[PDB]
Amino acid sequence: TELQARGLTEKTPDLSDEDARLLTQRHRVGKPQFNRQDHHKKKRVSTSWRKPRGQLSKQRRGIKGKGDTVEAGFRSPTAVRGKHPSGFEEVRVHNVDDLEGVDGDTEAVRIASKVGARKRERIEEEAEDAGIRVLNPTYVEV
Amino acid sequence: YAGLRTPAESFGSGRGQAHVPKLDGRARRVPQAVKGRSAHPPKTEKDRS
Amino acid sequence: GISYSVEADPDTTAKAMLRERQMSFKHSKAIAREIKGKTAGEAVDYLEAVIEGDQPVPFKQHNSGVGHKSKVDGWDAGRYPEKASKAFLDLLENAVGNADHQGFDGEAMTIKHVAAHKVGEQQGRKPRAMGRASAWNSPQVDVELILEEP
Amino acid sequence: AEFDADVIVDARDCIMGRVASQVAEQALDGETVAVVNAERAVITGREEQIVEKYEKRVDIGNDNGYFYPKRPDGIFKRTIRGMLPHKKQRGREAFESVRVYLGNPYDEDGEVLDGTSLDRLSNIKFVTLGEISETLGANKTW
RNA sequence: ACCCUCAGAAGGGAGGCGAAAUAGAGCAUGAAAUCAGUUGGCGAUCGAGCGACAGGGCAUACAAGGUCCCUCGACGAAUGACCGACGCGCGAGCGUCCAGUAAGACUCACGGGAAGCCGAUGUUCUGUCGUACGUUUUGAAAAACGAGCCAGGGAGUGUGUCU
RNA sequence: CGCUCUAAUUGGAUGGAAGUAGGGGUGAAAACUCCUAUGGACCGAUUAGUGACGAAAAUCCUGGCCAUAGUAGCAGCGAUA
RNA sequence: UGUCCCAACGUUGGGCCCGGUGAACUGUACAUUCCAGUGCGGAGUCUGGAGACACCCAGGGGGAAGCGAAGACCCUAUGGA
Ligand SMILES: [Cl-]
Ligand SMILES: [Cl-]
Ligand SMILES: [Cl-]
Ligand SMILES: [Cl-]
Ligand SMILES: [Cl-]
Ligand SMILES: [Cl-]
Ligand SMILES: [Cl-]
Ligand SMILES: [Mg+2]
Ligand SMILES: [Mg+2]
Ligand SMILES: [Mg+2]
Ligand SMILES: [Mg+2]
Ligand SMILES: [Mg+2]
Ligand SMILES: [Mg+2]
Ligand SMILES: [Mg+2]
Ligand SMILES: [Mg+2]
Ligand SMILES: [Mg+2]
Ligand SMILES: [Mg+2]
Ligand SMILES: [Mg+2]
Ligand SMILES: [Mg+2]
Ligand SMILES: [Mg+2]
Ligand code: NA
Ligand code: NA
Ligand code: NA
Ligand code: NA
Ligand code: NA
Ligand code: NA
Ligand code: NA
Ligand code: NA
Ligand code: NA
Ligand code: NA
Ligand code: NA
Ligand code: NA
Ligand code: NA
Ligand code: NA
Ligand code: NA
Ligand SMILES: [Sr+2]
Ligand SMILES: [Sr+2]
Ligand SMILES: [Sr+2]
Ligand SMILES: [Sr+2]
Ligand SMILES: [Sr+2]
Ligand SMILES: [Sr+2]
Ligand SMILES: [Sr+2]
Ligand SMILES: [Sr+2]
Ligand SMILES: [Sr+2]
Ligand SMILES: [Sr+2]
Ligand SMILES: [Sr+2]
Ligand SMILES: [Sr+2]
Ligand SMILES: [Sr+2]
Ligand SMILES: [Sr+2]
């Protein structure tokens, strides 16, 4: 009568104290948008980042208010870089065999979008049985 | 000779237009022109072995 | 052309459309805007009075150079677009007719939805001085109308 | 017409600019201030030079306009406006919480703000707002 | 096809076919510029590189993010008191002790709470900074040059020889 | 980092591929990825290659489109109809 | 002898309002400005003040160093005729 998602949807990974701290830091600090200079002034200029190269460029010269420029100083902590907000490390999966070798305490699986409903159903039941959470679960009425 | 079969000429300064070779009011020959030549296309003379 | 841009319950609604009409699109926006919410019958009497010159149609957007009209309410500029009005009368005639064929009281139904859309331009060319010709086009207008029970 | 002032200031024998400064400060802190006996407010210096300055402000102008007040009422109100960011939301709010009156329209007497008092027995080089207004051509309605 | 409407082989309505007519004739898909109607936010007393970063309002079906707030407690870097006591200074005020104490960003734990609620997204308001971009130039917001807008197109390639 | 096609190894798709629209997650970033709707047939990854491989600009090119604007003109001529 | 003092009245066609038809020039963006100042010394956009409720009609053109033409003048090019 209601929709429910298949699998270990609420599962959380177990992280060292230092990892939980850094994951929390990444989340607290965040980062600037880093959109291309003046993307908002012209529709033909997309948001995709491009180093400002104008000799007179205000953003390039680092004028406060013109937006931050991509620099290595903005990189996130090595120990957490790339983790899903839950703390899990993601593993891309295309079939049941891709589930092999995956540690459900430390990793969560993300089924590629191309995968069909028939193959997804098999992957989903096998993942749950292996104690692995599926980040993009199928919702069925139960 | 692709794109070069035309006597298109530029009008130069004076008509408020970019100096682009044109023929019958249509731009031609140059690489930035639609129907113009390919600037640095594949070449037969290239040794591919 | 267009497709009705709004949902309509077939059991309490009647529809009609005009296609590629060659009339002022700017005038059509003004007329639609003005008759929406009116009863089909009210719309008709209003448009006939517009054509007769007794009731002006408020020109709130396409008003450059348009002289003020005292009968315009809450606004200043207005005119009497008779051509587009007659096209709207054809539309209303079609709508109310469809309505009555369905068992509804056509004239009494409310104009729930009415909007004009520019579907194109019939292209034309006009010779000008100095050996050049410039565009001389006709707008093409589609208009949708949805009548609904009171 | 009834001004619920949290503070009533008596400008009689008080240096205009000093009162104006404390009143702007109070209004920005949320205080509703009524200045009274404006015609008796005082401004130090040589009368002839002070008058020249105010006359110049009256003579200035053009099509865009430079409407400068002539009554002590308005002279004082303007003096206060120049100490408030009247074009900003908070500034206009404060400014509109201040009103200046000729004479004292209230039953209460106003208080004399500390540091704004002028001692006539020790000063001869000063002028009264009312005197300035009359010189400017105002209609001595007070 | 049939029917209704209409001056009507038009168009419209209803209807029939097909998995699909939002496949009905330049008839696969259907971006942007942009137009009509409309939803959210702002709006007829107020100011202009249109934003970046902070922080408030209002708005939010699901899914793909799940956090967030307050009491208290633990930890506690640089920094770092009030009060009181004593002693100096014409005075504003200072010194010594209390004391490197109380406090101190982050993080965590107990207890309580939030689900438009936290993030996010749209818009708007406040604060700080802020006169596009590219080019020419010693010096560009420039009253120096270029572009109406969007999509697509648009510039180190080959042979031979040399290093 | 991204694009094309080739090869080897290895996967996805009518139980719905690519593309497109809106939205969620990741990466300092190029850009990667998922969800929903549309769509209705193709699509990847890794490794070694290939190159007519990346645009905001050139009074750049072609196409489409908005404001201009319901504005100018539809008067002027010895033929005022 | 209205060229002038010194302008007036009138006539026809426009102009203005209404139906129909219906372009072009031009457009980096923003833009209700004014006075000063500053700045590559000639600013609607920077700074300080002043003024400024929104929209629309008609007008004569002060400003946008207005639009229209890669200055004709001058110089320069181991340019042309
Ligand atoms: Cl790195
Ligand atoms: Cl139009
Ligand atoms: Cl004035
Ligand atoms: Cl202000
Ligand atoms: Cl004295
Ligand atoms: Cl921490
Ligand atoms: Cl190169
Ligand atoms: Mg953009
Ligand atoms: Mg070609
Ligand atoms: Mg007019
Ligand atoms: Mg000719
Ligand atoms: Mg199609
Ligand atoms: Mg491999
Ligand atoms: Mg391209
Ligand atoms: Mg460039
Ligand atoms: Mg005009
Ligand atoms: Mg000029
Ligand atoms: Mg030149
Ligand atoms: Mg010469
Ligand atoms: Mg010669
Ligand atoms: Na040819
Ligand atoms: Na060859
Ligand atoms: Na309008
Ligand atoms: Na009116
Ligand atoms: Na009226
Ligand atoms: Na003084
Ligand atoms: Na004045
Ligand atoms: Na907000
Ligand atoms: Na240049
Ligand atoms: Na520049
Ligand atoms: Na300049
Ligand atoms: Na144009
Ligand atoms: Na051009
Ligand atoms: Na005469
Ligand atoms: Na002018
Ligand atoms: Sr899919
Ligand atoms: Sr020339
Ligand atoms: Sr308008
Ligand atoms: Sr103070
Ligand atoms: Sr049908
Ligand atoms: Sr200003
Ligand atoms: Sr401590
Ligand atoms: Sr383009
Ligand atoms: Sr669309
Ligand atoms: Sr290319
Ligand atoms: Sr147009
Ligand atoms: Sr005539
Ligand atoms: Sr003529
Ligand atoms: Sr004129």
Side-chain angles (χ1 to χ4, degrees):
Chain A
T1 309
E2 76 178 308
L3 293 176
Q4 298 193 305
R6 297 170 175 165
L8 314 180
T9 253
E10 302 306 316
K11 192 168 180 174
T12 297
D14 34 309
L15 301 162
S16 66
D17 289 317
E18 191 55 11
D19 271 26
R21 186 173 116 304
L22 293 185
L23 183 65
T24 283
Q25 186 177 101
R26 182 186 85 177
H27 173 267
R28 179 208 324 131
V29 181
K31 61 185 166 190
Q33 299 181 68
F34 285 123
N35 289 319
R36 186 175 178 184
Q37 86 178 317
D38 294 341
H39 77 272
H40 61 107
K41 288 168 166 161
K42 212 68 171 173
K43 284 193 177 179
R44 64 167 185 264
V45 180
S46 72
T47 225
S48 178
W49 177 265
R50 292 281 152 39
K51 184 190 188 180
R53 314 236 189 182
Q55 301 293 136
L56 304 169
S57 176
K58 305 302 168 297
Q59 188 185 73
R60 186 191 117 294
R61 308 194 323 183
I63 285 180
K64 190 201 288 173
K66 296 304 174 172
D68 293 295
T69 245
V70 171
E71 276 185 300
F74 289 91
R75 283 281 226 179
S76 63
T78 293
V80 162
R81 191 178 299 164
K83 282 181 187 170
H84 176 275
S86 65
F88 277 115
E89 279 290 355
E90 294 195 11
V91 173
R92 187 115 186 290
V93 67
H94 309 267
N95 50 237
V96 182
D97 302 286
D98 283 323
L99 292 172
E100 197 164 60
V102 174
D103 173 11
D105 296 316
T106 264
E107 310 171 313
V109 91
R110 184 154 233 138
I111 301 175
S113 52
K114 271 188 212 163
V115 177
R118 181 198 295 122
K119 186 161 297 175
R120 271 179 65 79
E121 179 177 47
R122 291 179 195 168
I123 293 181
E124 284 182 285
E125 61 176 301
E126 211 77 303
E128 167 155 30
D129 284 301
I132 308 175
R133 170 180 169 182
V134 168
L135 296 172
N136 60 327
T138 296
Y139 284 76
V140 181
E141 8 46 56
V142 193
Chain B
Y1 272 112
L4 294 175
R5 295 135 171 161
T6 180
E9 278 198 304
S10 172
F11 286 87
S13 300
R15 47 176 59 198
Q17 220 128 51
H19 303 183
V20 177
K22 286 181 178 183
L23 196 88
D24 298 329
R26 219 128 239 298
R28 263 165 188 40
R29 186 185 302 114
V30 298
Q32 74 269 36
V34 173
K35 302 308 295 289
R37 63 181 282 247
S38 184
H40 295 296
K43 299 168 186 169
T44 258
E45 319 85 284
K46 183 190 185 180
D47 180 350
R48 299 147 194 279
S49 71
Chain C
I2 72 184
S3 294
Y4 297 87
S5 60
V6 170
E7 308 187 64
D9 181 315
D11 294 325
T12 78
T13 281
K15 312 171 177 183
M17 274 195 282
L18 286 181
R19 299 291 201 177
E20 288 180 294
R21 280 303 190 100
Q22 288 186 59
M23 50 188 200
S24 161
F25 173 54
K26 298 183 172 185
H27 290 176
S28 296
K29 299 188 211 196
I31 292 162
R33 163 178 295 122
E34 193 57 19
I35 69 177
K36 184 191 175 182
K38 286 187 173 170
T39 273
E42 301 175 308
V44 174
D45 293 331
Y46 174 74
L47 298 182
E48 298 186 319
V50 170
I51 296 178
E52 220 44 44
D54 302 324
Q55 213 68 52
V57 175
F59 277 22
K60 314 195 67 179
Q61 176 175 173
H62 303 289
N63 54 353
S64 52
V66 182
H68 297 180
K69 305 282 181 289
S70 58
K71 288 192 195 177
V72 166
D73 200 66
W75 189 245
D76 45 16
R79 274 181 175 173
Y80 316 86
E82 56 135 49
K83 190 176 178 179
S85 293
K86 296 181 183 170
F88 275 74
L89 280 178
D90 280 347
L91 182 62
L92 288 169
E93 161 175 62
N94 186 72
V96 176
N98 295 173
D100 295 325
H101 183 66
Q102 290 169 46
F104 291 109
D105 178 15
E107 302 188 309
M109 267 170 285
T110 297
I111 297 172
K112 181 198 177 186
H113 185 263
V114 59
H117 305 77
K118 183 168 192 174
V119 161
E121 292 197 316
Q122 172 175 276
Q123 290 175 297
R125 220 64 191 172
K126 167 75 64 175
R128 297 278 224 148
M130 315 317 291
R132 132 211 198 182
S134 59
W136 202 258
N137 308 328
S138 309
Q140 290 185 304
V141 180
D142 273 11
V143 43
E144 43 166 348
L145 175 83
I146 302 178
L147 296 175
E148 181 187 55
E149 287 187 296
Chain D
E2 295 182 64
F3 192 55
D4 222 312
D6 300 313
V7 195
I8 295 177
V9 177
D10 189 301
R12 182 168 186 165
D13 288 346
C14 296
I15 298 165
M16 182 190 236
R18 288 174 186 282
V19 170
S21 174
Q22 297 189 203
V23 173
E25 165 85 300
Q26 284 198 46
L28 283 167
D29 287 317
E31 290 290 67
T32 290
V33 187
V35 178
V36 162
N37 299 320
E39 73 271 12
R40 284 178 159 170
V42 125
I43 170 174
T44 297
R46 189 191 144 223
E47 183 167 8
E48 293 61 49
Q49 88 98 342
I50 287 168
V51 174
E52 274 188 49
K53 187 182 191 179
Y54 282 87
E55 295 184 303
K56 185 54 174 174
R57 293 176 170 180
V58 166
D59 292 337
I60 288 179
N62 46 36
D63 288 329
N64 183 259
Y66 196 87
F67 142 66
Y68 191 77
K70 298 180 186 181
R71 304 240 269 73
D73 205 8
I75 301 290
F76 211 139
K77 189 66 176 302
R78 180 58 73 86
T79 293
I80 291 172
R81 200 186 73 173
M83 288 177 226
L84 294 176
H86 66 288
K87 274 171 181 163
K88 281 202 167 189
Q89 183 196 66
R90 188 178 91 298
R92 183 185 177 188
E93 272 164 34
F95 184 60
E96 273 165 44
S97 290
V98 179
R99 290 196 191 164
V100 189
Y101 304 82
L102 296 176
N104 197 165
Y106 297 95
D107 294 311
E108 260 186 291
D109 289 64
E111 61 182 289
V112 174
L113 300 172
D114 269 286
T116 72
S117 185
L118 180 74
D119 175 22
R120 283 170 173 271
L121 300 190
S122 293
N123 297 283
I124 261 181
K125 296 191 74 171
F126 70 92
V127 186
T128 269
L129 265 193
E131 299 177 304
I132 289 172
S133 291
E134 292 185 66
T135 289
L136 291 187
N139 192 315
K140 178 169 179 180
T141 188
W142 54 96

